[PDB]
Design a protein around this ligand. Structure first.
Ligand SMILES: CCCCCCCC/C=C\CCCCCCCC(=O)O[C@@H](COC(=O)CCCCCCCCCCCCCCC)COP(=O)([O-])OCC[N+](C)(C)C
Ligand SMILES: CCCCCCCC/C=C\CCCCCCCC(=O)O[C@@H](COC(=O)CCCCCCCCCCCCCCC)COP(=O)([O-])OCC[N+](C)(C)C
Ligand SMILES: CCCCCCCC/C=C\CCCCCCCC(=O)O[C@@H](COC(=O)CCCCCCCCCCCCCCC)COP(=O)([O-])OCC[N+](C)(C)C
Ligand SMILES: CCCCCCCC/C=C\CCCCCCCC(=O)O[C@@H](COC(=O)CCCCCCCCCCCCCCC)COP(=O)([O-])OCC[N+](C)(C)C
Ligand SMILES: CCCCCCCC/C=C\CCCCCCCC(=O)O[C@@H](COC(=O)CCCCCCCCCCCCCCC)COP(=O)([O-])OCC[N+](C)(C)C
Ligand SMILES: CCCCCCCC/C=C\CCCCCCCC(=O)O[C@@H](COC(=O)CCCCCCCCCCCCCCC)COP(=O)([O-])OCC[N+](C)(C)C
Ligand SMILES: CC(C)CCC[C@@H](C)[C@H]1CC[C@H]2[C@@H]3CC=C4C[C@@H](OC(=O)CCC(=O)O)CC[C@]4(C)[C@H]3CC[C@]12C
Ligand SMILES: CC(C)CCC[C@@H](C)[C@H]1CC[C@H]2[C@@H]3CC=C4C[C@@H](OC(=O)CCC(=O)O)CC[C@]4(C)[C@H]3CC[C@]12C
Ligand SMILES: CC(C)CCC[C@@H](C)[C@H]1CC[C@H]2[C@@H]3CC=C4C[C@@H](OC(=O)CCC(=O)O)CC[C@]4(C)[C@H]3CC[C@]12C
Ligand SMILES: CC(C)CCC[C@@H](C)[C@H]1CC[C@H]2[C@@H]3CC=C4C[C@@H](OC(=O)CCC(=O)O)CC[C@]4(C)[C@H]3CC[C@]12C
Ligand SMILES: CC(C)CCC[C@@H](C)[C@H]1CC[C@H]2[C@@H]3CC=C4C[C@@H](OC(=O)CCC(=O)O)CC[C@]4(C)[C@H]3CC[C@]12C
Ligand SMILES: CC(C)CCC[C@@H](C)[C@H]1CC[C@H]2[C@@H]3CC=C4C[C@@H](OC(=O)CCC(=O)O)CC[C@]4(C)[C@H]3CC[C@]12C
Lengths: 592, 592
């Protein structure tokens, strides 16, 4: 795709260099070739390359100081020229010699007054999975990322703005957090903060947001950058006293905790795809904050909601047990017809006092289903299940009003969805909590991958079992009497939850005993135990990280409860200042 | 709670320091600020802080020697002042400068005659989970715990009592055992014992009990402090001879073995919550003592009690097999009534010689149940089971006398509790012993955690299965005919111990085949194998430490048998002295 086009422009770049004697002598720094071409005609001194590059760009790429100096003496207006293509738009040779860390050639270009504010907006510089570097857009950003302490100072002396932002809004401090070598990126962060002696007014530059709204501290939390997180936390950390081995430590807790309705650090870490962002939860001020919110306010409000939900589902269950049924009016159509009862009409469903007790429970059920929709729809997996529950309750309400047959099908969905939603409240308990993570990763992991191989063995053998018994009498062996039942029976024989079809009083077809023996080996022995071996591996992986997974469950529940409860009902965690003379900020004390 | 109040008093402390110029200059040692405030008015020289602290307390906290000396020259009566709050009651600055290890400021306070006997009874010093340090109450105790060898000597030279006890009764030697850095605590133990040259009469101070009764040696065993246990065992260890690589070693065995009716080291280690106390059992004199008690006296007396219990339960079983039954008098009420026999009245239960043989076995059963209560009630898990057994035997005795119907329900409990109590005697065998620890940790571990998720899937699907078949004829498919049976059937279908409901001669409801397929996947495949994967992990953890767990089972059995058998029947283990001229102490010889 774009990779194929980037491959072709890279080969087109090397061709145009070989086609041009100037670009070739710029690549391989033959001084005698460059001297002859310039003492001749212009020879395309402003030659536009394949990448939009010039000759002075080329000597910058290939680390050719002696070539680049002769090209600057030849034409000094090339120093200001930007590279002109979609890949490398607005890139100067000052950008290139910075990235190549060519110390003598950056000093030479700054002597010829190369711009330090030149923005490199080409798509090879944008933050994308296709690019292997994200350095920003400015030369100061590029030198900060290749860890060149000598070049960042020279750019600042020549007037590079430390406050310059790229198209994503990131300053140079944001970009350093996005870098793979974190320990070098810490030291460059400390260097660039030291040059914010002026301009700390109107923003201190460690507090600038990007276009997502993130400061460098919140970006370190969101990106899973734990090394930069601990280093940024030192600024927000205050030592209160030291009593030998003890230390009382006061944490700032402003951007960490939900200071406003805008998403804080706890919500952004839960609502992100990055697995390594969850490593911020066992960092020190974040870990005791989550535990404090849960024990004081999270777990009491959650256990109340689980108790109310459990009483409500018991109420819904009893209305389904006592659903209005009467003896059937019509006669039995076939001997296969097994139905004895049918559901009452609306006019006769409510005529006794026991029907009035059920009516109260049915209204409590319907009112609860509306409140589930009013909480959840005006906006997870249990998110979908409780909406699917409340939808099924309203469907059976509509069928009750218009007297529609088949209320058993919305109720049966609603019974199993209503009671399996109680497993949501297992996360109030630490031992019970990651059990449902095991169930999710066994369903949407092991089952969804291996059901396709199971379904095709079931389809093969049920089709074989169907045609083997297609000529036989079903009254003796009716497991495969029609093709939907044959398919359901083979699924049950797969799971060994029904017995193998046997009638010793008749002769079964010869082909059955061979096919069922082949089925018993591949399906019940091999593939069934293969799946169980997978799910035991899922169990082992989730139980290994179960404390970390439970803590991530607690934050998501705390973020959700704080979002839905009133602010009077959820007090802010920690200790506010300003009655102790600390400002209006809410602090958290940790004694270690 | 108290943590929130401790957080607030810590912030209130820092405010009152900032409110006071004296306390602020005491915190940050500005000598010019302290000089001006004292050459002015008193300026609250006896200013009471938030923690009950004074200015001289503050210079002690923040390691301000130059501040504290000026404050002592200003008012020397502050040197004697205690900190006055619930957190830090009776704390002096001599306490603080000791903990901060400020060597020049402890010498200055002792020059101004600061008390070495001052007790710090505040709740921040008490042994509690809320506190991170337990240092005791005296300055000598505090210097011993921060490992300051130079300060403990200076306190002793000024008259600090090495025999001072805190509110828990602990001397300084007890407190050192309770310290996290054991290797430093060994060296401080050796230092403080050297200053017991005088006063070894009336107690040698390594033999002082605390209020629980524990000496430092027994506290090292109870607290799991194996490093201090081995070091204390050197004093109780006597080398008898050395024959090249051999060494005959005589162990004192006084506090280890049950010298009196007061609890010894073996009973205290079993009857404690700490898992690391069980690490004392594989230390040298304790390990060969337990093996000696078991092989000589433990295992023969235990195998006799297990043989007698096995013969007794066989006697109880045969009386239940032969329980008095007669043909039923009334007629069959419904076709669902299956009962053919009923239990006899008392007057006809004993009329044949075979009824007389059973009467002897029933009295042997009743006498055994009374003896179980007389041994166990005038005081574990098998502790509860054998009492629950003997209660069920007396309940069926009462029902036999008053001719109450339903003796089958107390007997059935008594049959399964009586025979499962034979698994108690599996610990007489090392290979069989930790099997019952696996069963306990699979029941009260894996089952009690995961039954709640299982129960709610059973409740959801049994309710669905009940309403699906609520309109059908039960004679064809009666698994779910009423709601208790539907719930029991779904439990059995969960465990795959009954087959899936099928009748191929009728049409089952459409909703059944979908719901049972959903049930077969989530319950029989996924959640059932999830539990088995857990219990296999419990099996793997218990089988890894199975020798250590079996040895802990042997001590508990030995402690229980010694407590219940007469002293003539349980001889003291090891070799008494005084016929070999060693004193009256009982020794144990170990050749290594
Ligand atoms: C745990 C304890 C449960 C014990 C197990 C259940 C057994 C219980 C006995 C009788 O049958 C005759 C009629 O039966 C019926 O018709 C009852 C059908 C509806 C019952 C709901 C009552 C409404 C009260 C609404 C209450 C608010 C619902 C809660 C909302 C938060
Ligand atoms: C994850 C789930 C995967 C799917 C699992 C299983 C799917 C099951 C889902 C639904 C089935 C249940 C719905 C009932 C509908 C009734 C119609 C019927 O099927 O039978 C009809 C026949 O027609 C057929 O036999 C069609 C089946 C042929 C091939 C099936 C492959 C389709 C799925 C491919 C997916 C591949 C994916 C696998 C991997 C790529 C009529 O029944 P009869 O009694 O035979 O009448 C014949 C009358 N006669 C006597 C004259 C002869
Ligand atoms: C996962 C792998 C396991 C697969 C299991 C087996 C592999 C399959 C390989 C091959 C199967 C070959 C099919 C036979 C074709 C001829 C049909 C015929 O003549 O039927 C005749 C029988 O005649 C016979 O008995 C056939 C001779 C023995 C074949 C079966 C033995 C398989 C042993 C395998 C050894 C282990 C190999 C695997 C080791 C692991 C007549 O039948 P009838 O008795 O009169 O009944 C009448 C009913 N009917 C007419 C209505 C129909
Ligand atoms: C191992 C060997 C067992 C063999 C297996 C059992 C088979 C054995 C044969 C006959 O039926 C006719 C009457 O049957 C009865 O009525 C017997 C009911 C009570 C039997 C108990 C005898 C009491 C002796 C009390 C003895 C003290 C009890 C022990 C206390 C320490
Ligand atoms: C670890 C163990 C956990 C519990 C597991 C299972 C508990 C099982 C324990 C005991 C059950 C067995 C005792 C028999 C008593 C008979 C009464 C009866 O139940 O049926 C009665 C109906 O009334 C009901 O249907 C009540 C049930 C509704 C909801 C059940 C939830 C209660 C437990 C919540 C705990 C949640 C904990 C889970 C996680 C939070 C009558 O029967 P019927 O035939 O239907 O009559 C209807 C007549 N009709 C035809 C007119 C319609
Ligand atoms: C753990 C997850 C597994 C869940 C398993 C299944 C998921 C459930 C999802 C959805 C179930 C939807 C319910 C149907 C609602 C309409 C009712 C209806 O019209 O009935 C009609 C049939 O009409 C049909 O046949 C319906 C069309 C097919 C639905 C069933 C195929 C499910 C395939 C799923 C593919 C794999 C998906 C999952 C892959 C893993 C009439 O019924 P009847 O035949 O005439 O019988 C009469 C008896 N009765 C009137 C007394 C009642
Ligand atoms: C007539 C009255 C008494 C009915 C009783 C009402 C309650 C039983 C209902 C009404 C609203 C419900 C709540 C609506 C929203 C949610 C969020 C929901 O969150 C998720 O499932 C999202 C997280 C995830 O997907 O895992 C969990 C259930 C809960 C607390 C519900 C619990 C049960 C509640 C309190
Ligand atoms: C009437 C019949 C046909 C209904 C079919 C039942 C299934 C569609 C239901 C019943 C139980 C449900 C499951 C119950 C519990 C979970 C675990 C749940 O896991 C989590 O949410 C992870 C934990 C976390 O979010 O912290 C994801 C949904 C899932 C698999 C549910 C998916 C839908 C299931 C399989
Ligand atoms: C678990 C496995 C890997 C170990 C070896 C077992 C199978 C390879 C063997 C054991 C029993 C054998 C079966 C025993 C009896 C028969 C019946 C025989 O056909 C008959 O005579 C049946 C009567 C009829 O056709 O009606 C065909 C072979 C078959 C299925 C045999 C096929 C091969 C089987 C399954
Ligand atoms: C008519 C006569 C012959 C009846 C026979 C009497 C014995 C069969 C009974 C009487 C007292 C019983 C003992 C009473 C107390 C105990 C302690 C009990 O200890 C525990 O279960 C506690 C440890 C734990 O909980 O694991 C184990 C069974 C045992 C030895 C009992 C074994 C069976 C004994 C010897
Ligand atoms: C008539 C029916 C309804 C009675 C129900 C039977 C259960 C209540 C009983 C039968 C077997 C019993 C179990 C048999 C063995 C053990 C192992 C036992 O493990 C230990 O004591 C650990 C070993 C040790 O102490 O060294 C704890 C009790 C437990 C789980 C028992 C708990 C109670 C159980 C499950
Ligand atoms: C083990 C799993 C993860 C792998 C794939 C198996 C299931 C996804 C498939 C295999 C067989 C299928 C069943 C085959 C037959 C039927 C009957 C069909 O309804 C009927 O026509 C039955 C007749 C009646 O309603 O009375 C409804 C779908 C269902 C349950 C199918 C649902 C999906 C099943 C369970």
């Amino acid at each position: 795709s774009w990779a194929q086009s980037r491959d072709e422009q890279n080969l087109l770049q090397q061709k145009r260099i070989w086609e041009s004697p100037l670009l070739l002598a710029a690549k391989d720094n033959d001084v005698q070739a460059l001297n002859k071409l310039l003492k001749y005609e212009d020879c395309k001194v402003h030659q536009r390359g394949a990448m939009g590059e010039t000759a002075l760009h080329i000597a910058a790429l290939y680390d050719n100081l002696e070539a680049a100096m002769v090209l600057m003496e030849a034409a000094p207006e090339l120093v200001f020229e930007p590279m002109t293509s979609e890949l490398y738009e607005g890139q100067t040779a000052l950008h290139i010699a910075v990235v190549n860390q060519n110390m003598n050639l950056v000093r030479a270009l700054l002597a010829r007054r190369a711009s330090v504010s030149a923005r490199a907006t080409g798509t090879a510089f944008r933050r994308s999975p296709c690019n292997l570097i994200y350095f920003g857009e400015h030369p100061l950003s590029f030198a900060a990322c290749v860890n060149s302490e000598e070049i960042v100072r020279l750019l600042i002396e020549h007037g590079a703005d430390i406050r310059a932002q790229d198209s994503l809004g990131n300053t140079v401090l944001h970009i350093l957090i996005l870098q793979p070598n974190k320990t070098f990126a810490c030291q460059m962060y400390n260097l660039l903060l030291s040059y914010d002696r002026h301009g700390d007014h109107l923003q201190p530059l460690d507090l600038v947001p990007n276009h997502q709204g993130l400061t460098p501290f919140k970006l370190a939390g969101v990106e899973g950058n734990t090394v930069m997180f601990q280093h940024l936390m030192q600024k927000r950390k205050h030592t209160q006293w030291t009593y030998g081995p003890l230390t009382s430590t006061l944490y700032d807790l402003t951007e960490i905790d939900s200071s406003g309705d805008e998403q804080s650090l706890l919500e952004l870490i839960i609502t992100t795809k990055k697995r390594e962002a969850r490593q911020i939860l066992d960092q020190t001020p974040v870990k005791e904050l989550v535990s404090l919110k849960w024990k004081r306010y999270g777990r009491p409000y959650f256990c109340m909601l689980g108790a109310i939900y459990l009483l409500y589902i018991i109420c819904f269950t009893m209305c389904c047990i006592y659903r209005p049924l009467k003896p059937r009016t019509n006669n039995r159509t076939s001997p296969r017809d097994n139905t004895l009862l049918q559901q009452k009409l609306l006019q006769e469903a409510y005529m006794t006092p026991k029907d009035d007790i059920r009516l109260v429970g049915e209204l409590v059920t319907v009112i609860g289903a509306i409140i589930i929709l009013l909480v959840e729809v005006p906006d997870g997996p249990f998110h979908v299940l409780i909406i699917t529950y409340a939808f099924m309750v309203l469907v059976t309400m509509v069928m009750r009003l218009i007297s529609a047959s088949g209320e058993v099908v919305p109720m049966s969905f609603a019974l199993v969805l209503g009671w399996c939603n109680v497993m949501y409240f297992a996360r109030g308990f630490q031992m019970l909590g990651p059990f449902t993570i095991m169930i999710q990763k066994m369903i949407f992991g092991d089952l969804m991958r291996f059901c396709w191989l199971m379904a095709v063995v079931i389809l093969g053998f049920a089709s074989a079992f169907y045609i083997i018994f297609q000529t036989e009498d079903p009254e003796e062996l009716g497991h495969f009497y029609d093709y939907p039942m044959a398919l359901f029976s083979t699924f049950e024989l797969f799971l060994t939850i029904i017995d193998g079809p046997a009638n010793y009083n008749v002769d079964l077809p010869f082909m059955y005993s061979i096919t069922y023996a082949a089925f018993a080996i591949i399906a019940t022995l091999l593939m069934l135990n293969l799946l169980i071996a997978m799910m035991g591996d899922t169990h082992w992986r989730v139980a290994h990280e179960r404390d970390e997974l439970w803590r991530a469950q607690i934050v998501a529940t705390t973020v959700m409860l704080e979002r839905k409860l009133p602010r009077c009902l959820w007090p802010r965690s920690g200790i506010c200042g300003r009655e102790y003379g600390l400002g209006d900020r809410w602090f958290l004390r940790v004694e270690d």
